[PDB]
Design a protein around this ligand. Structure first.
Ligand SMILES: Cc1cc2nc3c(=O)[nH]c(=O)nc-3n(C[C@H](O)[C@H](O)[C@H](O)COP(=O)(O)O)c2cc1C
Ligand SMILES: Cc1cc2nc3c(=O)[nH]c(=O)nc-3n(C[C@H](O)[C@H](O)[C@H](O)COP(=O)(O)O)c2cc1C
Ligand SMILES: O=C(O)/C=C/c1ccccc1
Ligand SMILES: O=C(O)/C=C/c1ccccc1
Ligand SMILES: [K+]
Ligand SMILES: [K+]
Ligand SMILES: [K+]
Ligand SMILES: [K+]
Ligand SMILES: [Mn+2]
Ligand SMILES: [Mn+2]
Lengths: 497, 497
């Protein structure tokens, strides 16, 4: 069998054909080595590593693919892995990736198709035959509090009433032979659904975790699509085809047919266990910071022959926690603003900001017609975004006018630094949900779960009134066209590079 | 001849030997073309252009050297032009450049030596023989309000009492055949001295403007060394040799003997004229924003045979306004903090911030012994720096701990973004002098000359108490040494770049 965006195995082959894979066929240790290689790949934008000979792999469990959604070295196909998740050309721009991820938002869902089997059923291990401590689960960072099996798989949970089935990524580590512990925190949909089952109080939550799912599905799993929306039908609509699912053996949830590895079991409504610390998206680990997390019981494993586990070695720039979490949040915030009648054209979370900022490009013609002010406009934008789930992970919003390409961090930093007067041009939001994972939040001076947010207005005064009143002091804007072309045409004759 | 740091002509030759020069011997227009080529060089870190055939050059006035203090493409000799100003190896780090610029601060001055002639006296034009509108003065940006002769020369003014002779860079444009207009603004030393002469009220200020001075001298001219300190003696001390000066023909000021071009005349204590707009350091020009500036009368020109005028085409990254203004201010702020008993080890103005921020590296062992808090420490640092001239051009200070290399913008941005909680971890300063050239100041929503400053504390809580409590989630810190070296040693065997 199938296309790369619909089948993870095909996706691996696509990375190979792209000359974007390195297959490592000698033995590699899942204790730190695989993740160290992965981390270095992410820091240097190298090819994705496929570990075909992992120390501890037994009976087909498992190979690892690192850096599945990380950056390539070239400018021209920078985002090519992300484009391979989506059937887009590998030279796709981030605007085009994010528009593809948003395209299903005003389409009818395409619900999924149930099929009686698939590759994910090629092998199975019951509750007497596996031990999660005996699989080659990686230790990703040297201070991690456990072996994090789950960095890039898909949790599947369903509302008690059956009407919403959510797919999302949330980390989890091995607790013991048949349990994991993981993050399940508000306002995430796995948490929202968990709360529904705990209020009902009758049973633990039926659960599955599918690794190596269809790449289109893992991207939606990382996106804050709306409350109540079933990701399978959104992915269906986005890709134009109904996803094929197979029922779990031990519960009534449905998993992608071509999933590499499937865990089936339950998410407890009563039990917790030690979880963390972990080397997280903002670039840190706090050794010894263990806290109680949600507890999962695993009842069954099913898997493809020669199964491959994807793994994100996350931390400092650049990995999936930046390219997918930040960009996909930004996409959804762009739509959210437009649906609130705000004149936002584009949004992106600058990597430079460790994806804690989102830059919002403003249609200043529309803003002018509003006949508003910075104070009022900043307040309106921050109230929309920081009161919504899509804004959770974002602590600063930077408003910029039409001359700025929000997908270019250098230009966002320029505009922030030169057009937003500290204090006066900003509004602080202390009574909104904060993201505790940011070190200044959970390890900072104030409440870990509240406040610490700001809207920074990098619109100039005349952008609200009569129009931009400057030209940039750059080659593009400070010279006439004919002169610029002469200069360019004579550049190498004169002796330049 | 003489050494490059003491003779501009030799400096040009040094750039040639370095394969860091392009000599353009075909005719180039000073109306925009020279500056467009220069601007492109600055935006791309290319070789410095030497325009040997400038349209309008007559009787030896003049050639142009663009981008004299801009960046080279290579990491290894990035700051090599700056090192060629100072007799440093071309691979010098910015720490080593700034330490060289600070080294004279606790040395006896070496006063200058008067010599009876020099190259700058090879040619002269009296008050009947030159016309500044007839020289090939550049139009640097298409919207500039005049032809800016003066971007990288040295103004020379002396206190009425004779005790302080100041050298500094401040822009100036041609007003008419025998006058310039320029910026003379508080708290700059040219302004301080001008105020002394206006209070005396007896005469205009004797003045000289020397272009193509000794490179060591132009660097000190761009540095905020202390009030009352004569730059010639500081440069003497920094270079270990007494600078040779020659007296002006028409006044009693002394100019470097090897100056390429010298204007002699007066800075008016009563007259003003239109000045600006200009494409400035923060990357903008506001067309039509002309204001009254200081007025200079030119009485005489003297110049070297085959004189060369240096020119800064300034604007967006990277030019002399960033590499020299920002870095040299940062240097002086590092010293200022240390002399105020603050535990600052290093300071740099990130280019990413358009040199409007300075990151201050804190010796956190010393900070711990202080037994203080963020609120108190931020207040103490901002009061020191924002109440001083060295802090003028800087609107945000970012305090970072010992793990951050302040000379690496990516690391400053990481620490700012992840360790400083907006609002709570910052202190705003509204009753300090502001820098009006920043667009958010002079073209912003608030007072152009006051406030808009902030100290942003990117120290984590335990950096004040018991010590850093994290490890970075990066290759360097999240893996043991033996493993990292294995990975590195096997990198290209495995198939990576
Ligand atoms: C590599 C990676 C790791 C992630 N880790 C977590 C995590 O541990 N906890 C979490 O709630 N979200 C995590 N996310 C982000 C969520 O997947 C994202 O917020 C998504 O919107 C959640 O789905 P939902 O909107 O259906 O709740 C991770 C995403 C990626 C790409
Ligand atoms: C290319 C360049 C252009 C500059 N333009 C100006 C200017 O127009 N006005 C100004 O006051 N300072 C200007 N500066 C900065 C001053 O030279 C710097 O603030 C210096 O500390 C002034 O000397 P002083 O401390 O003796 O007053 C410029 C510096 C450079 C490198
Ligand atoms: O463990 C991590 O690095 C990231 C976790 C996370 C939690 C909630 C939303 C987004 C990311
Ligand atoms: O004209 C410019 O771009 C820069 C001017 C300036 C003025 C005062 C201090 C530093 C720079
Ligand atoms: K999701
Ligand atoms: K603003
Ligand atoms: K000076
Ligand atoms: K802090
Ligand atoms: Mn969801
Ligand atoms: Mn001075």
């Amino acid at each position: 069998a199938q296309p790369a965006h619909l089948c993870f195995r095909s996706f691996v082959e696509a990375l190979k054909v792209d000359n974007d894979l390195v297959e490592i066929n000698t033995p590699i240790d899942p204790n730190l080595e695989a993740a160290a290689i992965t981390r270095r790949v992410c820091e240097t934008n190298d090819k994705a590593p496929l570990f075909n000979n992992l120390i501890g792999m037994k009976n087909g469990l498992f190979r690892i693919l690192g850096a599945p959604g990380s950056l390539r070295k070239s400018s021209a196909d920078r985002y090519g892995r992300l484009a391979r998740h989506l059937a887009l050309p590998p030279t796709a721009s981030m605007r085009e990736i994010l528009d593809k991820m948003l395209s299903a938002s005003d389409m009818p869902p395409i619900p999924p198709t149930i099929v009686p089997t698939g590759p994910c059923k090629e092998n199975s291990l019951d509750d007497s035959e596996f031990d999660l401590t005996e699989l080659p689960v990686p230790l990703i960072h040297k201070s991690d509090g456990g072996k994090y099996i789950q960095t890039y798989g898909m949790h599947i949970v369903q509302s008690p009433d059956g009407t919403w089935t959510n797919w999302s990524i949330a980390r989890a580590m091995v607790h013991d032979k048949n349990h994991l512990t993981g993050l399940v925190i508000p306002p995430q949909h796995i948490w929202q659904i968990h709360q529904m089952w705990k209020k009902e109080g009758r049973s633990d939550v039926p659960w599955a975790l599918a690794f190596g799912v269809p790449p289109a599905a893992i991207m939606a799993s990382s996106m804050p699509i709306p409350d109540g929306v079933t990701e399978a039908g959104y992915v269906g609509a986005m890709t134009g085809s109904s996803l094929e699912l197979v029922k779990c053996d031990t519960n009534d949830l449905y998993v992608p047919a071509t999933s590499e590895i499937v865990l089936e079991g339950t998410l407890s409504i009563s039990e917790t266990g030690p979880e963390g610390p972990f080397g997280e998206m903002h670039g840190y680990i706090f050794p010894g910071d263990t806290h109680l997390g949600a507890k999962y019981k695993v009842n069954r494993i099913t898997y493809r022959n020669n199964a491959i586990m994807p793994m994100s070695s996350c931390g400092r720039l650049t990995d999936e926690t930046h390219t997918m979490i930040g960009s996909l949040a930004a996409a959804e915030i762009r739509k959210l603003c437009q649906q609130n009648d705000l004149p936002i054209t584009d949004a992106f979370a600058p990597f430079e900001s460790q994806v804690t900022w989102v830059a919002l490009r403003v249609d200043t013609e529309k803003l002018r017609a509003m006949k508003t002010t910075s104070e009022g406009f900043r307040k309106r934008v921050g109230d929309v975004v920081f009161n919504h789930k899509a804004g959770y992970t974002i602590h600063r919003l930077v408003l910029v006018g039409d001359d700025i390409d929000v997908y270019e961090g250098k230009d966002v930093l320029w505009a922030f630094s030169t057009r937003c007067r500290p204090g006066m041009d900003e509004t602080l939001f202390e009574d909104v949900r904060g993201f505790p994972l940011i070190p200044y939040m959970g390890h900072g001076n104030g409440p870990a779960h509240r406040g610490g947010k700001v809207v920074s207005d990098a619109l100039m005064p005349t952008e609200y009134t009569t129009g931009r009143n400057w030209e940039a002091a750059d080659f593009n804007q400070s010279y006439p066209e004919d002169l610029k072309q002469k200069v360019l045409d004579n550049w190498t004759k004169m002796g330049f590079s």
